């Protein structure tokens, strides 16, 4: 029953005897399979025989760990000063993109739709663009509107450039107002591809036809990052300590972390429009996530920039590599304060490495994340046994194999590009590992296979505020190390807490 | 500091309309109004608001699409079917487990709700068509999910644009695998909102489930057999409703579609009466069942004790003295709980003002529960309500209430900023800006991960949640002490 | 059996069938109580009747949550530049103090003993002091030697000042070399008292007989703090942003976090000896922990300083109060960057407060920590029901009552000064609460009463590196908030993870 | 780059001695040596001074008599309440830090991982603590009714203020009908943990054995042994017990890891005492030999060489049946031994180790290291006596650096100079060594691992040494730009 003195909501309420009885009564008429059949099929789904059939799938995807392009377009556009993402196409898409980002960040996410309906299949979406851009510009006072497309707009084949010019001709926005655009088809690639397409469209808008006035600065593209708030602040701190001259291209770290102080800020921070325009002048562009930027880096190279890409740098060696690259670009040494951070991180790893050596992992997410996380795991003496990225290519599989081969701890390990979390479930059920690193969807894998989850990849919907703290840098690596250790120590204590049975090992000091 | 509420609300309407270009202004002006005094159940207010028409481009509507209304709302909760999100990967990723339509099941084994199944269209699928891929998918489901009793095909935007024939696939494969396959044309370019998805989805139940031989000829009927229609069991709401209906003496044949199985849906035409909670989403199939099977339907409301008691009495009056006595016994059983809830929370909440914005039902349906706690509604509106929803709203809201159909982000921000209610009840896209303004917010779709709110057990939770949002120490900390 | 392919150490090894059988055989001969008697007594120890007998103890302490004075003396002395703690008395004490600190910080802890033996009960410890100081000075090249006492040295009544002067007269150390001293009796107070006594002895050594040359700086004493490493760095960050002129008196934040880079640093960082000497000139001294400093603040007041004490400032209001006080001293406003941090913290609390409202807690530790943690809990809408400090006085109980009375969430809360963790166990068993906030010894309370532990108080022996991150400041408050939420969410997921039984509530988004 | 090890060790000794003032230097010089060539078999010969006072101010690693009594001997006894009698510190720092494992329901039938204290305040020092102690005993009797006995572990102030805990113990034993053992292990007594051992052994004699037989009904067998001096660190005594029982012995009691008071009381009924830790419990074995005619024999269960030799040695004292049992046990575990060696010896052979531990392990573990191809190049004891140093010659080779009661300064310099591949010592030594870029494994707590005794323990030992040394962390010490 319910009680006002100790109110029972859903979780405990439905375990009350009257609900259990009711639900048992309902079950008698549901025509669901009998309990013994459920056990039989459940066990079978955990078998090698089921694994073989599951891995022979050719057409069905189940619990894929990837989103569609426009999510990445909204994300990247949101990192420019007073910029509204305008997704030309069907409005259900935008409701979804905004809700997905809000649930991860616990923050507002603003974007608009041109609200194309069925009549655009016959007539095209010109009036949606013209009227939409007029309404967005007037209502939301953006400095820039960044246009992307939903899958209906792609199939219909609307000419974005011509539509935008017609809008200007009709006075929707001022003639000089910035309306960069990109095609972002959901049926190619994933959200990382949309990030790349949208960013290229923004840069092309500002750079096309220009000759650089070369300078020695470096542009830095962070990529699609669930930890952008903490990570970009850490990045800035590092760059400041080194004295590097840079521009971050797409910074969402203020946008997705505004204060609650009585004012709602629709926009905050981001790459300045004039900085984006002046970024053509840099001699170097670096991407912190290869797979978020290949078309963008090719476009940078077309202005004679030298480019380098990283793979979501986590841990000692990846951070070392980034700092050495920054040092080479800038001609500035790594300063003593950063070397002290490095040495403190090494101290933590040496202190704690008995708990990390020989641990086995499954890791999934975006391709750069998986690589980066795997590399950090190898530095700990761990084994990144099952690595998986639904949006990872064969080229990425090859890069992963080269990483595995670089360490004696990589000997079991495999990278599964193009596989989904139903595939991962069969891996975890047949070749058990200690820990699973992923995103909130991984909680189902924890439930189904008893493999504990650590959330280090977008989206994180079932824990709050993790995105506020870094995972990059020496500081972020230390945060990640403590997150891993805490999960291990929590399990050790849980495994040894049963009085007179397992608590002989319930050590006070570990 | 002093205002006339109806006039102030009319000023806010003028203020937001001045922000638009002329073309958009002329469209929006018909969707904003103030509830008028009603002509001398009972109508408390009267108004005319335009509804269920296209959204204006570029304005930041809150609306979703027909796929959300079909897959997200109607079909997705049906627990022992595999629902294929048919098209590219996005729709089924964003809608994976975000609607809290609770069920009892072993997910991945006998139930498939909190999962994404998709055809994951690539460019070759767009160019050559996806029917052959869909056929293969159906075979892969049949093999890897052998306890699934049926399959639905939830069309995303590209399906109808490229000319695929999912109905031909469904007919062919149903014969091969011997399980119901339901093709739904809920592509997001259809209609203007979630609403048309409801209707398409209801038609699909009519056309693909209610077709064919009776699979339940052995079912034993009783005089008190009902279906609960349009309760999607958010946080257990349907279960909290079901217990009351059973205590009163009814037998619930099926609840559509929260915690529903295909068998329960198939048996619905065997019941004596359809009890409809969500009128918007499932009135279509009720009208069908009335026409084809002579099953009458009646609307009820299980939000808060006023409505619950009136609903039980109304429903019971359709049966006999035994059920009527059951209603009275149920109401008496829970009166101590109701009194305890009111005594604890009404002093903490009375006189507070609330603005709502939700989809198709809750903008009116929750109002009397608020009123039972002494709270008043000063603004409400629907994403996708129709005229018949706005008309029913007049039974619940008072003269002077601001009314907004398909409200835009700009509008709703200004209305909230101007009114400064004590609480806003709306969705996830609305929650965080409102809190940043220093205004309490409770999610009126997901119940902010709480609930149930339906029924007597739900009323206690509802009260608790409204109180903990409004009466908590955080608001007093917004202003730094040196400012 | 053992297996070289998957080695079993103690925890899994003794669950193997051969060990279970062996241990069942051993039990037959141990003459331990039978299982039904164990159940009967265990249940009784969780009863109200037992609680009453337990709380009627007058003389026996069981599982107290306090240490002895010299631990605090070692701690505070370790925060001065190149300073060696020299504990006059019995050497067993020093092995213990050093081990206790090392296990918490995962770092070296250096201190020496005068190695008094039974001979000193008859003759006194003069030669131990003379020779000891000579040996410490020559071997370990300190800039300062800070003398404290063990309980035997206190009982014997050695005259420290005379012994030290004799040591100088014999050439053990140079005549001008700094050898501050304090009496630190284990049988008075606790470690916090030793911190106070030792710090007073250091300041008295440098200040005695001087006239100040007044300046507007503020001296800041952090107190005995398990989070000193992260906390002092945060404090410095805040002070820097504000532009306050200050001296921290005892800063162990480098000393207990040196790098692993091939060099062992016996000493690092700390309050400069000349800064300690010049600290007499400050107009203000503030203590961040009242109970670590009362004798020290009285001594500061004897040089005309104005003093203020805080209670381990955690959360929004306590941080606000500290900054307002720093602003009053310095005449500098709180800068915009700190106000942004505050507003971000308020955002996080408003985002998450549905998980915090109405949560009930037990909290123990040092008096200032308990107060500060309780204050932060009340700001979240939680109820600090059972607050306890073994070293908390009646005056502390009164301060706690005032805190409880300030909030509607404090109704029914109680503060138990002088009680121990066996008392706490009866509170948890009879008046159940959601969460327990304490130190590692609280793991036994988690085991015995099924109340989950959050570790936020010294010592933390069973988790690694938590001390490296702040709990003070707006940033530390955000860290604490996430720690609390992560514990709540982990439990919510654990309660809802059983397929087809409790997982109707295993929500993806929370 | 090239050195003569013995001479280089001697030079290190000269270097550290130069650092001291003259007075301390003369004391320390007798405690530092290099093992010489030897004239069962002595590998080396060594004269080192030992078991004398520490020099003031030098940063000894030693503890006190209370650690040796409460922390070591008595504290593990699971069904007694051990009162840390005096101020709060001693029993706080020693609360659950020694991993003497046991099976029990703590707080209910077992009391090991707890602090019980009289928490002396100034009044107790001034007026005496005996009345407080009497009350404490009554409170224990009421609130911990399944405790079978109580010990009183004296901290420094007890003997200094003239309290009479023996009178309290006699009085309360008669009142509550449970054994009360007063131990005079105040930390001012002796020079180290060692005298605590001896005082604690004498208290077992005087207050447990010296009493009427409570086990007259015990049925004896010809194969009844006590294991004496195995404190079950990480389960070490359980991994030892299984082998002894597989060989055909019956273990009457294991002192004191996982021990109950009943097991200790029955010890004089056994046929033979098997002593692992000679240092800590040889006293009570010598007593039992004299008083009860029970012989005692030393054994070593670290590593397969010692385990096999030990099983054979022990079995030879019984009969052909037990001798056959020894062979059968050795054969049963040979495949495990071979597997451990094949996996880990290639990863570890040729590596050099320095040790520093308390009273036994500085010699006892050496052959386990040698079984993995590792060599010991320095060892020493905190509190070993001359007879430990003499036994060490059976295990270490000529040229090994030997340090008694080593100072922090000395041991730092020795490790920095030698740069061994691994150091095995305690918690106070671990972190500075790792900062130097030298692998370290705790040789007291087993770095929270173990067991290391027995065949099952050898696999864990090997694993742990390998993961410390062959780990990627070391390669990351030097920043790539330096
Ligand atoms: S179905 Fe409808 S938007 Fe009637 S699409 Fe929507 S679970 Fe709303 S106001 Mo989300 S017509 Fe249900 C609804 Fe109401 S998803 Fe839920 S809360 S009562
Ligand atoms: S009892 Fe002794 S110091 Fe023999 S006091 Fe010490 S658990 Fe050491 S070398 Mo800690 S004579 Fe045991 C010992 Fe050895 S505590 Fe342990 S490891 S085998
Ligand atoms: S040699 Fe003595 S018996 Fe040994 S450990 Fe030291 S007191 Fe104890 Fe000390 S730690 Fe504090 S100051 Fe006394 S109470 Fe105890
Ligand atoms: Fe937020
Ligand atoms: Fe460390």
Q: What whole-number distance in Å separates Cα of residue B310 and Cα of residue B371?
A: 15
CATH at C365: 3.40.50.1980
Using a CB-CB distance cutoff of 8 angstroms, which residues of chain C are in contact with residue D477? 260-262
Q: Which stretches within B294-448 are classed as H helix?
A: 304-317, 321-349, 362-365, 367-372, 387-393, 409-419, 428-436
Task: Please indicate if any CB of chain A lies within 8 Å of the CB of B105.
Answer: yes
Q: According to CATH, what is the number of the domain B66-208?
A: 3.40.50.1980
**Tokens for B281?**
């989403």
Residue of A nearest to C488 (CA): A463
Q: Is C287 helix (H, G, I), strand (E, B) or coil?
A: strand
Q: What whole-number distance in Å separates Cα of residue C309 and Cα of residue C300?
A: 12
User: Which residues are registered as beta bridge partners of B425?
Assistant: B356, B442
Q: Is C363 helix (H, G, I), strand (E, B) or coil?
A: strand
| Spacing, Cα D445 to ligand 2 middle (Å) | 10
Q: What whole-number distance in Å separates Cα of residue B22 and Cα of residue B8?
A: 23
The boundaries of every CATH 3.40.50.1980 domain in chain B are 1-65+348-483, 66-208, 209-323
Q: Is B155 helix (H, G, I), strand (E, B) or coil?
A: strand
Count Cβ–Cβ pairs < 8 Å, chain B vs chain C. 74
Q: Residues followed by a break in chain B, C–N over 2.5 Å? A: 40
CA atoms within 13 A on the CB side of A227: 24
- Contact between chains at C348 and A466 (C-beta distance less than 8 A): no
Q: What whole-number distance in Å separates Cα of residue A270 and Cα of residue D446?
A: 52
Q: Is D242 helix (H, G, I), strand (E, B) or coil?
A: helix
Q: What whole-number distance in Å separates Cα of residue A479 and Cα of residue A155?
A: 45
A 12-51 → B contacts, CB under 8 A: 13-14, 18-19, 22-23, 25-27, 29-33, 37-38, 41-42, 45, 50
Same domain, A349 and A483: yes
Residue of C nearest to A476 (CA): C469
**Is C351 flagged in the annotation as binding?**
yes
Q: Cα–chain-centroid distance for residue C465?
A: 15
Say what the resolution is, in angstroms: 1.8
Nearest to A97 by CA among D208, C495, B91: B91
Q: Which chains sit next to D, with 3 or more Cβ pairs under 8 A?
A: A, C
Task: Respond yes or no on whether the N-terminal peptide bond of residue B109 is cis (omega within 30° of 0).
Answer: no
Q: Which of A112, A130, A151, A173 is catalytic?
A: A151
Q: Say if A491 falls within a structural domain.
A: yes
Q: What whole-number distance in Å separates Cα of residue D396 and Cα of residue D403?
A: 13
Distances (CA, A) of C406 to A158, B348, C350, C396, C481: 64, 19, 21, 15, 21
* DSSP string for residues in C199-235: HHHHHHHHHTT-----EEEEEEE--S-TTHHHHHHHH
**Tokens for A445?**
């894998």
The boundaries of every CATH 3.40.50.1980 domain in chain D are 1-64+347-482, 65-207, 208-322
Same domain, A365 and A404: yes
Name the helix (H) or strand (E) containing A198: helix A191-207
Q: Are D293 and D212 in contact (CB under 8 A)?
A: no
Strand ordering across the sheet containing C306-309: C246-248, C215-221, C282-287, C306-309
Q: Which of D28, D82, D189, D197 is catalytic?
A: D197
Q: What whole-number distance in Å separates Cα of residue D463 and Cα of residue D480?
A: 30
Distances (CA, A) of A480 to A345, A354, C486: 11, 16, 15
Range of the domain at C479: 315-358+472-510
Q: Is A57 helix (H, G, I), strand (E, B) or coil?
A: coil
Q: Which residues contact C110 (CB under 8 A, 6 or more apart)?
A: C78, C84, C85, C98, C140, C266, C267, D59, D408
Q: Are B349 and B467 in contact (CB under 8 A)?
A: yes
Of C1, C103, C190, the CB nearest to D427: C103
Same domain, C85 and C196: yes
Task: Please indicate if any CB of chain C lies within 8 Å of the CB of D76.
Answer: no
Q: Cα–chain-centroid distance for residue A217?
A: 27
Q: Say if A42 falls within a structural domain.
A: no
Domain boundary among C163, C187, C211: C211
Torsion of CA B236, B239, B241, B242, to 10 degrees: 170
Rg of chain A, C-alpha, whole Å? 25
Same domain, C204 and C218: no
Q: What whole-number distance in Å separates Cα of residue D455 and Cα of residue D329?
A: 10
Exposed, middle or buried, A198 (CB in 10 Å: 0-12/13-18/19+)?
A: buried
Of C66, C135, C188, the CB nearest to D55: C135
Q: Say if A3 falls within a structural domain.
A: no
**Tokens for D200?**
């604690």
**Tokens for A11?**
């979780």
Residue B125 is classified by DSSP as H
Name the helix (H) or strand (E) containing D230: strand D224-230
Q: Select from 1.10.3720.10, 3.30.70.1450, 3.40.50.1980, 3.40.50.720 the CATH code of D1-64+347-482.
A: 3.40.50.1980
Q: According to CATH, what is the number of the domain B209-323?
A: 3.40.50.1980
Q: What whole-number distance in Å separates Cα of residue D92 and Cα of residue D97?
A: 10
Q: Select from 1.10.3720.10, 3.40.50.1980, 3.40.50.720, 3.40.50.2300 the CATH code of D208-322.
A: 3.40.50.1980
Q: Is B8 helix (H, G, I), strand (E, B) or coil?
A: helix
Q: Are B189 and B157 in contact (CB under 8 A)?
A: yes
**CATH architecture assignment, domain D65-207:** 3-Layer(aba) Sandwich (3.40)
Q: Which of D67, D368, D462, D468 is catalytic?
A: D67
Domain boundary among A155, A183, A211: A211
- Contact between chains at D436 and C185 (C-beta distance less than 8 A): no
Torsion of CA D343, D345, D351, D356, to 10 degrees: 90
Exposed, middle or buried, C218 (CB in 10 Å: 0-12/13-18/19+)?
A: buried
Residue A15 is classified by DSSP as T
**Tokens for D136?**
């404490």
Q: Is C487 helix (H, G, I), strand (E, B) or coil?
A: helix
Ligand 2 atom 16 nearest Cα: D444
Give the residue carrying structure tokens 């029953």: A1
Q: Are D62 and D383 in contact (CB under 8 A)?
A: yes
**Tokens for D203?**
């208290």
Q: Are A264 and A112 in contact (CB under 8 A)?
A: no
Distances (CA, A) of A74 to A195, A227, B98, C89, D142: 8, 16, 20, 69, 69
Distances (CA, A) of D291 to D205, D220, D253, D284, D285: 11, 18, 18, 10, 10
Same domain, A157 and A301: no
D 183-222 → C contacts, CB under 8 A: 187-191
Ligand 3 atom 11 nearest Cα: D89
Q: What whole-number distance in Å separates Cα of residue D452 and Cα of residue D464?
A: 10
Helix, strand, coil percentages for chain D (3-state, nearest 5): 50, 15, 35
Widest distance between CA atoms in chain B: 76
Q: What whole-number distance in Å separates Cα of residue C425 and Cα of residue C46?
A: 8
Distances (CA, A) of C38 to B288, C15, C450: 67, 21, 18
Name the packing angle between helices B409-419 and A126-140 (round to 10°).
Answer: 20
Residue D76 Cβ inside 6 Å of ligand 2? The answer reads no
Q: What whole-number distance in Å separates Cα of residue B417 and Cα of residue B433?
A: 11
Distances (CA, A) of A439 to A364, A442, C5, D331: 8, 6, 31, 50
- Contact between chains at A463 and C489 (C-beta distance less than 8 A): yes
Q: Is A435 helix (H, G, I), strand (E, B) or coil?
A: strand
Of A102, A116, A135, the CB nearest to B429: A102
Show binding-site residues of A for Fe(3+): 106-107, 347, 351
Q: Are B426 and B444 in contact (CB under 8 A)?
A: yes
Nearest to B38 by CA among B362, B397, B367: B397
Distances (CA, A) of C133 to C145, C161, C166: 8, 13, 11
Task: Please indicate if any CB of chain C lies within 8 Å of the CB of D26.
Answer: no
* DSSP string for residues in A316-378: HHHHHHHHHHHHHHH-PPPPHHHHHHHHHHHHHHHHHGGGTTT-EEEEESSHHHHHHHHHHHH
What number of H helices and E strands is found in chain A? 21, 13
Task: Please indicate if any CB of chain D lies within 8 Å of the CB of A320.
Answer: yes
Q: Which residues contact D65 (CB under 8 A, 6 or more apart)?
A: C92, D185, D186, D187, D188, D189, D190, D192, D193, D195, D196, D199
Q: What whole-number distance in Å separates Cα of residue A176 and Cα of residue C472?
A: 49
DSSP β-ladder status, D272-275 and D296-298: parallel
Q: Which residues contact C459 (CB under 8 A, 6 or more apart)?
A: C100, C103, C104, C226, C439, C440
D and B touching (3 or more beta-carbon pairs closer than 8 Å): no
Same domain, A82 and A207: yes
Nearest to A178 by CA among A145, A138, A203, A200: A145
Ligand 1 atom 4 nearest Cα: B278
Neighbours of ion ligand 4 (CB under 5 A): A 106-107; C 347, 351
Total residues belonging to chain D: 482
Torsion of CA A458, A462, A463, A464, to 10 degrees: 90
Which of B189, B192, B473 to substitute to test the interface with A, most A CBs within 10 Å? B189
Q: Which stretches within A150-190 are classed as H helix?
A: 151-156, 160-169
CA atoms within 13 A on the CB side of C202: 38
Q: Are D245 and D251 in contact (CB under 8 A)?
A: yes
Q: Are B337 and B460 in contact (CB under 8 A)?
A: yes
Q: Cα–chain-centroid distance for residue B175?
A: 34
* DSSP string for residues in C126-184: HHHHHHHHHHHHHHH--SEEEEEE-HHHHHHT--HHHHHHHHHHTTSS-TT-B--B---
Q: Which residues contact A66 (CB under 8 A, 6 or more apart)?
A: A190, A191, A366, A390, A391, B89, B93
Q: Could you say which ligand is closest to the alpha carbon of residue B366?
A: 1
**Tokens for B28?**
């929006």
**Tokens for A457?**
């990849």
Give the residue carrying structure tokens 């999610």: B443
Name the helix (H) or strand (E) containing A26: helix A17-30
Same domain, A368 and A326: no
Residue D72 Cβ inside 6 Å of ligand 2? The answer reads yes
Neighbours of B74 (CB within 10 A): 31
User: Quick check: is D197 catalytic?
Assistant: yes
Q: What whole-number distance in Å separates Cα of residue C289 and Cα of residue C294?
A: 9
Ligand 1 atom 1 nearest Cα: B281
Q: What whole-number distance in Å separates Cα of residue D223 and Cα of residue D270?
A: 8
Same domain, A220 and A171: no
Count Cβ–Cβ pairs < 8 Å, chain A vs chain B. 322
Work out how many domains chain A is built from and give that number. Answer: 4
**Is C341 flagged in the annotation as binding?**
no
Q: Which residues of C are catalytic?
A: 151, 155
Same domain, A486 and A338: yes
Q: Are B302 and B244 in contact (CB under 8 A)?
A: yes
The phi, psi pair for C444, rounded to 5°, reads: -70, -30
CA atoms within 13 A on the CB side of D31: 27
Q: What whole-number distance in Å separates Cα of residue D257 and Cα of residue D230?
A: 6
Of A93, A114, A262, the CB nearest to B437: A262
Q: Say if A29 falls within a structural domain.
A: no
Q: Are B275 and B253 in contact (CB under 8 A)?
A: no
Domain boundary among A314, A342, A375: A314
Beta strands in A72-163 (DSSP E): 83-88, 112-113, 144-149
**Tokens for A64?**
């894929």
User: Quick check: is D62 catalytic?
Assistant: no
Q: Are D109 and C38 in contact (CB under 8 A)?
A: yes
Q: Is B64 helix (H, G, I), strand (E, B) or coil?
A: coil
CATH class for domain B1-65+348-483? alpha beta
Distance between C190 CA and the closest CA of chain D, angstroms: 8
Mutate to test the pocket of ligand 3, among D84, D155, D193 (most ligand atoms within 8 A of CB): D155
Distance between C411 CA and the closest CA of chain D, angstroms: 31
Torsion of CA C267, C269, C270, C275, to 10 degrees: 120
Total residues belonging to chain B: 483
Q: What whole-number distance in Å separates Cα of residue D70 and Cα of residue D91?
A: 9
Residues with CB under 6 A from ligand 3: C 68, 70, 90, 92-93, 96, 150-151, 186; D 64, 66, 86-87, 89-90, 155-156, 186-187
Exposed, middle or buried, A467 (CB in 10 Å: 0-12/13-18/19+)?
A: buried
Q: Are C440 and C475 in contact (CB under 8 A)?
A: no
Using a CB-CB distance cutoff of 8 angstroms, which residues of chain C are in contact with residue B482? 323-324, 327, 333-334
The phi, psi pair for C331, rounded to 5°, reads: 70, 10
Q: What whole-number distance in Å separates Cα of residue A306 and Cα of residue C148?
A: 63
Q: Are C176 and C143 in contact (CB under 8 A)?
A: no
Widest distance between CA atoms in chain D: 75
Q: Is A92 helix (H, G, I), strand (E, B) or coil?
A: helix
CA atoms within 13 A on the CB side of C221: 35
User: Which residues are registered as beta bridge partners of D340?
Assistant: none
Same domain, A321 and A453: no
Q: Which residues contact A187 (CB under 8 A, 6 or more apart)?
A: A151, A154, B87, B88, B121, B122, B123, B125, B126, B158
Q: Which stretches within B117-190 are classed as H helix?
A: 123-128, 131-144, 158-162, 166-177
Same domain, C187 and C72: yes
Q: Which residues contact B398 (CB under 8 A, 6 or more apart)?
A: B35, B44, B45, B376, B377
Q: What whole-number distance in Å separates Cα of residue D323 and Cα of residue D247?
A: 8
Task: Please indicate if any CB of chain D lies within 8 Å of the CB of C258.
Answer: yes
Ligand 2 atom 7 nearest Cα: D231
Distance between C260 CA and the closest CA of chain A, angstroms: 5
Q: Say if A54 falls within a structural domain.
A: no
Rg of chain C, C-alpha, whole Å? 25
Distances (CA, A) of A73 to A115, A288, A295, B91, B433: 17, 17, 14, 16, 22
Total residues belonging to chain A: 510
DSSP β-ladder status, C282-287 and C215-221: parallel
Same domain, C115 and C188: yes
Nearest to A397 by CA among A427, A378, A418: A418
**Tokens for B248?**
């009163």
Distances (CA, A) of A394 to A254, A491, C377, D132: 35, 35, 51, 76
């Amino acid at each position: 029953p319910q009680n006002v003195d100790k109110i029972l909501d859903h979780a405990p309420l439905f375990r009350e005897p009257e609900y259990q009885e009711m639900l048992a009564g309902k079950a008698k008429l549901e025509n669901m399979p009998p309990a013994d059949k459920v056990v039989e099929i459940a066990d079978w789904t955990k078998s090698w025989e089921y694994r073989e059939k599951n891995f022979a799938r050719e057409s069905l995807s189940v619990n894929p760990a990837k989103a569609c392009q426009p999510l990445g377009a909204v994300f990247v556009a949101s990192g420019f000063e007073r910029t509204m993402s305008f997704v030309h196409g069907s409005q259900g898409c935008v409701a979804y993109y905004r809700s997905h980002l809000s649930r991860h960040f616990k923050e507002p996410s603003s974007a608009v739709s041109s609200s194309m309906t069925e009549d655009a299949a016959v007539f095209g979406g010109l009036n949606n663009m013209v009227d939409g851009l007029a309404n967005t510009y007037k209502l939301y006072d953006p400095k820039m509107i960044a246009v992307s497309t939903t899958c209906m707009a792609e199939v219909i084949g609307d000419d974005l450039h011509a539509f935008i010019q017609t809008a200007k001709g009709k006075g929707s926005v001022p003639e000089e107002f910035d309306v960069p655009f990109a095609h972002t088809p959901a049926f190619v690639g994933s959200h990382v591809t949309g990030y790349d397409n949208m960013l290229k469209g923004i840069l092309e808008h500002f750079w096309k036809g220009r000759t650089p006035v070369p300078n020695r600065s470096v542009n830095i593209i962070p990529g699609f990052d669930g930890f952008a708030v903490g990570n970009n602040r850490e990045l800035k701190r590092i760059l400041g300590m080194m004295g590097v001259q840079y521009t971050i291209l797409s910074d969402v770290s203020d946008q997705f972390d505004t204060p609650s102080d009585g004012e709602y800020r629709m926009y905050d921070g981001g790459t300045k429009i004039e900085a984006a325009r002046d970024a053509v002048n840099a001699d170097y562009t670096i991407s912190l996530q290869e797979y978020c930027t290949p078309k963008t880096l090719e476009y940078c190279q077309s202005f004679g920039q030298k480019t380098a890409s990283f793979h979501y740098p986590l841990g000692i060696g990846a951070t070392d590599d980034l700092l050495q690259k920054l040092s080479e670009i800038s001609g500035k040494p790594v300063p003593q304060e950063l070397e002290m951070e490095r040495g403190r991180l090494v101290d933590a790893l040496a202190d704690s490495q008995a708990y990390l050596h020989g641990k086995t992992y499954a890791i999934y997410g975006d391709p750069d994340f998986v690589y980066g996380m795997a590399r950090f795991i190898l530095e700990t003496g761990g084994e990144p046994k099952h690595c998986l990225a639904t949006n990872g290519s064969k080229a990425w599989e090859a890069q992963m194999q080269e990483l595995f081969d670089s360490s004696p701890f990589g000997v079991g390990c495999k990278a599964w590009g193009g596989k989904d979390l139903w595939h991962m479930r069969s891996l975890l059920a047949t070749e058990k590992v200690d820990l699973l690193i992923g995103n909130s969807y991984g909680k189902y894998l924890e439930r189904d296979t008893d493999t504990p989850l650590i959330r280090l990849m977008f989206p994180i919907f079932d824990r709050h505020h993790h995105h506020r703290f870094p995972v990059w840098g020496y500081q972020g690596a230390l945060r990640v190390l403590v997150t891993l250790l805490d999960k291990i120590f929590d399990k050790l204590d849980d495994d040894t807490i049963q009085a007179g049975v397992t608590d002989y090992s319930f050590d006070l000091t570990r | 500091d002093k205002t006339n509420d109806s006039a102030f609300h009319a000023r806010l309407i003028a203020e937001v309309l001045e922000a638009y270009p002329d073309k958009a202004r002329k469209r929006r002006q018909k969707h904003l109004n103030v509830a008028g005094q009603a002509e001398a159940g009972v109508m408390l207010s009267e108004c005319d608001v335009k509804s269920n028409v296209k959204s204006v481009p570029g304005v930041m509507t809150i609306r979703g699409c027909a796929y959300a209304g079909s897959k997200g709302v109607v079909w997705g909760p049906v627990k022992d079917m595999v629902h294929i999100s048919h098209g590219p990967v996005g729709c089924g990723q964003y809608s994976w487990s975000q609607r809290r339509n609770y069920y009892i099941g072993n997910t991945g084994v006998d139930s498939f709700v909190t999962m994404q199944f998709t055809s994951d269209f690539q460019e070759k699928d767009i160019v050559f068509g996806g029917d052959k891929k869909l056929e293969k998918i159906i075979d892969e489901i049949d093999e890897l999910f052998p306890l699934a009793k049926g399959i639905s095909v939830q069309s995303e935007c590209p399906i109808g644009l490229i000319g695929d024939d999912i109905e031909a696939v469904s007919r062919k494969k149903k014969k091969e695998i011997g399980k119901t396959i339901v093709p739904v044309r809920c592509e997001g370019f259809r209609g203007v909102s979630q609403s048309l998805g409801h209707h398409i989805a209801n038609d699909a139940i009519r056309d693909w489930v209610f077709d064919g031989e009776d699979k339940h000829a052995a079912f034993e009927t009783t005089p008190y057999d009902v279906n609960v229609i349009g309760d999607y069991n958010i946080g257990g709401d349907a279960w909290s409703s079901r217990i009351l209906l059973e205590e009163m003496g009814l037998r619930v044949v099926g609840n559509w579609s929260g915690d529903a199985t295909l068998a329960e849906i198939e048996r619905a035409p065997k019941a004596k009466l359809n009890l409809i909670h969500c009128y918007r989403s499932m009135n279509y199939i009720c009208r069908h069942m009335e026409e084809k099977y002579n099953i009458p339907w009646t609307e009820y409301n299980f939000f808060g004790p006023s409505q619950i008691a009136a609903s039980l009495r109304k429903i019971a009056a359709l049966f006999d003295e035994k059920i009527q006595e059951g209603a009275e016994r149920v109401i008496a059983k829970y009166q101590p709980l109701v009194d305890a809830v009111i005594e604890k929370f009404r002093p903490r909440l009375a006189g507070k003002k609330v603005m709502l914005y939700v989809g198709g039902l809750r903008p009116r349906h929750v109002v009397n529960a608020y009123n039972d706690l002494g709270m008043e509604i000063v603004g409400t509106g629907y994403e996708f309500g129709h005229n018949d929803d706005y008309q029913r709203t007049g039974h619940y809201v008072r003269e002077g209430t601001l009314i907004y159909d398909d409200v835009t982000g700009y509008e709703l921000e200004k209305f909230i900023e101007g009114i400064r209610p004590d609480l806003v009840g709306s969705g996830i896209k609305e929650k965080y800006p409102v809190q940043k303004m220093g205004i309490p917010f409770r999610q009126m779709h997901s119940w902010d991960y709480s609930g149930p709110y339906h029924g007597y057990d739900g009323f206690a939770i509802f009260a608790r949640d409204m109180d903990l949002a409004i009466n908590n120490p955080v608001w007093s900390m917004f202003k730094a002490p040196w400012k």
